Amino acid sequence: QSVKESGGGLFQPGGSLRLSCSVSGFSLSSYAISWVRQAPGKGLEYIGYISSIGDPYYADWKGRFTISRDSSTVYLQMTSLRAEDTAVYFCARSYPGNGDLGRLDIWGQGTTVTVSSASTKGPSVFPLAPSSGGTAALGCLVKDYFPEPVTVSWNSGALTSGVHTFPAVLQSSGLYSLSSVVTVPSSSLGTQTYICNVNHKPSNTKVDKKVEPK
Amino acid sequence: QLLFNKTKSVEFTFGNDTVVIPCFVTNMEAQNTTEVYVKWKFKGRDIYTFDGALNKSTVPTDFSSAKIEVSQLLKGDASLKMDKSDAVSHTGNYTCEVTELTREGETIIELKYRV
Amino acid sequence: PMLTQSPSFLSASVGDRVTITCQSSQSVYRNKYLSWYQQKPGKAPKLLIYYASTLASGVPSRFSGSGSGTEFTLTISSLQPEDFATYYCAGDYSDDIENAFGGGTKVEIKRTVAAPSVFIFPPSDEQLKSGTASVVCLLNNFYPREAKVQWKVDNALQSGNSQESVTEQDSKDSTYSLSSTLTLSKADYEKHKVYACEVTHQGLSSPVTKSFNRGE
Ligand SMILES: *[C@@H]1O[C@H](CO)[C@@H](O)[C@H](O)[C@H]1NC(C)=O
Ligand SMILES: *[C@@H]1O[C@H](CO)[C@@H](O)[C@H](O)[C@H]1NC(C)=O
Ligand SMILES: [Ca+2]
């Protein structure tokens, strides 16, 4: 039993948001599907649901939503978009099939929608190289992208211990940039390769950047 | 884990003074009424509730005549009775949720008007 | 039915206890339809407790929901760093148009003070080729969050030149990391030699400084 939401991304104010929640391992005839969102930095906001007999119902507010479903997926459609629609959107399984808020138990990972008139822009990726105890830091500066999010992996995921990927910061330029660092023994610079795996799906950008010591 | 003798839908016309929407749970296991809870749901709204612990029935002012024969509850009958004016105003799909202790169940009936 | 949780500043040490109240303006359905959820940063919410006191399958018994009607409370006993999260209550009501979450209450594990390990990174030749130069000062695995970073360029204090970013509380060991980014033009960056960031923090007796000379 699991649910999976489609990609979000950048949405213009004239655009229409369409999100799909593909469930598996259970039937929509037996459970309600709930849609929740969260503004960046803010709290969970309950949107509405669609009951197990296929009927949708919506909470008390701002937005123009329409929840629908077919045999195996549930669609959230939004119209007349606003800056305050910029949120991470979650679909979740709700137990009382009639749609009461008994329990939300199987959640999706969530997707970020950015409502902005701004154009997407892929990132530039620069190495953060150690120079000089016995521990060395090194990382990857991920500069000038739009919108969020960026994803950063190290050595294709085989390196996770000691990794710190910072929250993106918004620059005066109106563009995001972040750092992602990792700490290792100073002796491993020269025998171990470190490569940062940057992804930016709005801009179709995959950057693999050998961070090497100068 | 409650189960039900399901009816897909029940019909009624202008001749109907009263309307029965049936609800029959088959594996009820309670011997006193205070453990049983009943709720009828319409368009996201609890239009009838019976909290067995408290012997209290509650209806919104727009389902004023909606009821259940509490004398039939342990036997499994949670069916809803309404007058014709509250029914013809609220046709559609109903949900019957019965709770006996932790055991819970739901079943669905469409109220349809024939003209 | 607006839900008000404890204002988001709930703290305790490893093994201590935290308490988070959730208040409802209308009483919830059957006085007990109130669920508790745990959200760590960047993750989906996880259900902990439902019907006010029933625990989700696999949730340790140190999470305890009590209350009824309009008043509920989540007691986290035997606190541990794996519990740094924000916590939401959710209510059901007799018309679903009112179902809502609370505003969230973040929990923060107190641990023993830990001074940061500082590293300073010079710009890349890749980026200098672009006309801009980023200097990155990294403050690693410190506690608690209050830290101060002073940028200096040939012993000259900087201002309005820097952007920061701080991780959330680490789930494995309850520390924080911080990154400072000095942004200079290529021109400005190559008119100077010594680039340093001064880190002052409760775990350091004397402010630590970490530098580099342009061209090592
Ligand atoms: C009532 O519910 C059933 C399934 O439970 C559905 O197929 C039917 O079309 C519904 N009727 C209306 C009028 O929504
Ligand atoms: C409506 O009335 C007819 C008799 O006229 C009866 O058979 C039927 O059960 C009634 N329907 C409901 C929903 O009560
Ligand atoms: Ca409800």
Residue numbers in the entry:
A (entry chain D): 1 to 61, 63 to 133, 138 to 219
B (entry chain F): 1 to 115
C (entry chain A): 2 to 217
Sentences from the paper on this structure:
Cluster of differentiation 47 (CD47) is a widely expressed transmembrane protein that plays a crucial role in immune self-recognition. Cancer cells upregulate CD47 expression to promote immune escape through activating the “don’t eat me” signal via interactions with signal regulatory protein α (SIRPα) on macrophages.
To understand the molecular mechanism by which Hu1C8 induces low hemagglutination but exhibits high antitumor activity, we determined the crystal structure of the Hu1C8 Fab fragment in complex with the CD47 ECD (amino acids Gln1-Pro121 of HuCD47 with C15A mutation) at a resolution of 2.5 Å. The L1, L2, L3, H2, and H3 CDR loops of Hu1C8 form a large, shallow pocket to accommodate the CD47 epitope, while the H1 CDR loop does not participate in this interaction. The conformational epitope of CD47 consists mainly of two structural segments from the β-sheet of the ECD, namely, residues 37 to 46 (β3, β4) and 97 to 108 (β7, β8). The interacting interfaces between Hu1C8 and CD47 are dominated by hydrophilic interactions and bury approximately 756 Å2 of the solvent-accessible surface area of Hu1C8 and CD47. As the side chains of Asp97 on LCDR3 and Asp101 on HCDR3 and the two water molecules not only serve as ligands for the metal ion but also form hydrophilic interactions with the epitope residues Lys39, Lys41, and Asp46 of CD47, we speculated that the binding of the metal ion to the CDR region of Hu1C8 played an important role in the specific recognition and binding of Hu1C8 with CD47 and the formation of the Hu1C8–CD47 complex. Replenishment of EDTA-treated Hu1C8 with several bivalent cations commonly found in organisms showed that compared to Fe2+, Mg2+ and Zn2+, Ca2+ could efficiently restore the binding of Hu1C8 to CD47.
